[PDB]
Write a protein that binds this ligand. Structure first.
Ligand SMILES: *[C@@H]1O[C@H](CO)[C@@H](O[C@@H]2O[C@H](CO)[C@@H](O)[C@H](O)[C@H]2NC(C)=O)[C@H](O)[C@H]1NC(C)=O
Ligand SMILES: *[C@@H]1O[C@H](CO)[C@@H](O[C@@H]2O[C@H](CO)[C@@H](O)[C@H](O)[C@H]2NC(C)=O)[C@H](O)[C@H]1NC(C)=O
Ligand SMILES: NC[C@@H](O)CNS(=O)(=O)c1ccccc1F
Ligand SMILES: NC[C@H](O)CNS(=O)(=O)c1ccccc1F
Ligand SMILES: NC[C@H](O)CNS(=O)(=O)c1ccccc1F
Ligand SMILES: *[C@@H]1O[C@H](CO)[C@@H](O)[C@H](O)[C@H]1NC(C)=O
Ligand SMILES: [K+]
Ligand SMILES: [K+]
Length: 501
């Protein structure tokens, strides 16, 4: 509908520049007729989700690389894609003028944008906050009579969530996660540092903490927001670490098991919010499968846990087959969901690299890895940051797919935004991953899914410098002759006519 306005900041690719009167956008989503495919292309050279169409052909005479769709080989159903409405993201979005705020939110949540259908909401403050607070800071209030939402929620986050929901045609799911409890429930009496809930699961401290979740859901329900899921704690391993710099609450896996079994599971199930799903872990994948074994081999905890939330720190390496693969093998009925991903977190990495194609490729490669290892969704971290990668009260700056520059009333869409978009826009909730088989060894990364209405989507990532000709075969439909240019990502969509073999 409106093309990217590119700008270079001296990194490998460009950002797209948006402001109070202009942002790139798509037309309303339409499928090509039977016999035609749609291709959306982004390239390092600067193409940004450019649409082209081609014929599906009955015949293929070539002998080069063939990717054959396996539409009856079915894997996981997809919950969706989105990102996090932290205090930092809310402050950056609202620092824009109302026209630019609108264009930013449309970029993410509308059908003329990339179709996000998940928002992660911190329960009170985290590092991406400028004030440290919980919802029940008044000490020894075990019945939580003074629980209440501050303006960070009522004036910033809740109104923005409502605006996102109005722009979305897809139903949006909210996920909530706490970082710290009130300090009077913790062993160390501080929001950060090494410390856990006082006492033992099943006691007053633990019962109060579980009740805080229900008060949170109650308070958001007064504002007409309902949650799809909650996690039992953001990064429970972090609060076991001496000197941890920001809000945390430490649980060993046995502690989380007992908390869920004795306190959180029973309290949620006894509430009006009993349909809210509970996700365990909410931490890095190398804690799996150990954490899953500890929690899910206890039948009393197991009966409360709907899924396992995992974090992706894209600056780091970790095995996927031994963590996500093994967890799926051992616990195939417990969904895996990626609840946070970020890049640029190491202190020595420039937090915001405007126009980094490499960070874009890290994002899409991670998403493909995630989907090939049975994960049902992918959630980015902060929806928007400033050019420092903040604000952040401990200076823990990081990158974001949208960077806001208040001094120019401008925001910049990073390659990461488009890499994520190649998935979020084209994979509706309820899509199912299907198999995709290469005829010969090759350098491409790819994934195939089927929409709820039977349509096909294939994402093809080329992290190499070399242009790779290829053909996609859909046994029921025909052949798509294409090329994967060096340093590109493509999404292919087509309708699948009924066909008998
Ligand atoms: C927002 O950005 C747009 C796009 O860059 C600006 O519009 C451009 O302005 C230059 C300078 O006058 C023109 O030469 C271009 O033709 C314009 N392009 C388009 C597509 O309109 C616009 O001025 C900016 N708006 C604000 C409020 O700063
Ligand atoms: C389970 O939830 C019910 C909600 O009905 C709680 O029952 C109420 O508890 C409050 C005090 O906490 C009383 O003022 C009400 O009279 C109770 N209502 C009824 C209908 O009995 C109950 O406390 C919860 N149980 C837990 C958390 O163990
Ligand atoms: N030509 C295939 C090869 O390049 C690997 N790509 S892949 O199969 O898509 C893939 C598998 C596992 C994790 C991430 C991945 F990207
Ligand atoms: N994982 C979420 C947690 O709130 C920490 N925020 S962060 O963006 O991941 C991060 C940034 C900089 C340095 C270290 C970090 F962990
Ligand atoms: N429209 C949102 C829907 O839930 C799925 N969208 S879609 O089918 O992948 C699509 C098709 C054509 C053009 C753009 C698209 F996004
Ligand atoms: C495909 O091949 C066969 C001939 O072997 C025939 O159906 C047709 O001529 C070819 N072309 C198309 C577009 O079907
Ligand atoms: K309060
Ligand atoms: K950094």
């Amino acid at each position: 509908a409106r093309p990217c306005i590119p700008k270079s900041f001296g990194y490998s690719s460009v950002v797209c520049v948006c402001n109070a009167t202009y942002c790139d956008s798509f037309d309303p989503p339409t499928f090509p007729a039977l016999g035609t495919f749609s291709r959306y292309e982004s390239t390092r050279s600067g193409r940004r989700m450019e649409l082209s169409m081609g014929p599906i052909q009955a015949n293929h005479t070539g002998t080069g690389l063939l990717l054959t769709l396996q539409p009856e080989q079915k894997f996981q159903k997809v919950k969706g894609f989105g990102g996090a409405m932290t205090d930092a993201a809310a402050l950056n979005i609202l620092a824009l003028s109302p026209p630019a705020q609108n264009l930013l939110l449309k970029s993410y949540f509308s059908e003329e944008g990339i179709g996000y259908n998940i928002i992660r909401v911190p329960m009170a403050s985290c590092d991406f906050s400028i004030r440290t607070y919980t919802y029940a800071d008044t000490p020894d209030d075990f019945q939580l009579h003074n629980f209440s939402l501050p303006e960070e929620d009522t004036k910033l986050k809740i109104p923005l969530i409502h605006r996102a929901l109005q722009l979305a045609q897809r139903p949006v799911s909210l996920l909530a996660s706490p970082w710290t409890s009130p300090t009077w429930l913790k062993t160390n009496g501080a929001v950060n540092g090494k410390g856990s809930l006082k006492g033992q699961p099943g006691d007053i401290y633990h019962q109060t903490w579980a009740r805080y979740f229900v008060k949170f859901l109650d308070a958001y329900a007064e504002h007409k927001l309902q949650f799809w899921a909650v996690t039992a704690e953001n990064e429970p391993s972090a609060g076991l670490l001496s000197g941890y710099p920001f809000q945390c609450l430490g649980f060993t896996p046995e502690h989380q098991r007992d908390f869920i079994a004795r306190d959180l599971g029973p309290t949620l199930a006894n509430s009006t919010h009993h349909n809210v799903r509970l996700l365990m872990l909410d931490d890095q994948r190398l804690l799996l499968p150990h954490w899953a074994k500890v929690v899910l081999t206890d039948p009393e905890a197991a009966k409360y846990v709907h899924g396992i939330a995992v974090h992706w720190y894209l600056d780091f390496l970790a095995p996927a087959k031994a963590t996500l693969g093994e967890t799926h093998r051992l616990f195939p009925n417990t969904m895996l969901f990626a609840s946070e991903a970020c890049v640029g977190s190491k202190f020595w990495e420039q937090s915001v690299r405007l126009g980094s194609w490499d960070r874009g490729m890290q994002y899409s490669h991670s998403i493909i890895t995630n989907l090939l290892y049975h994960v049902v969704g992918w959630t980015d971290w902060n929806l928007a940051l400033n050019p420092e990668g903040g604000p952040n009260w401990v200076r823990n700056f990081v990158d974001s797919p949208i960077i806001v520059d208040i001094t120019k009333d401008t925001f910049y869409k990073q390659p990461m935004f488009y890499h994520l978009g190649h998935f979020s826009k084209f994979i509706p909730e309820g899509s199912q991953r299907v198999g995709l088989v290469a005829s010969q060894k090759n350098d491409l990364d790819a994934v195939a899914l089927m929409h709820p209405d039977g349509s096909a989507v294939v994402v093809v990532l080329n992290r190499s410098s070399k242009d790779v000709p290829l053909t996609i075969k859909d046994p029921a439909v025909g052949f798509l002759e294409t090329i994967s240019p060096g340093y590109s990502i493509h999404t292919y969509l087509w309708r699948r006519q009924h066909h008998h073999h």
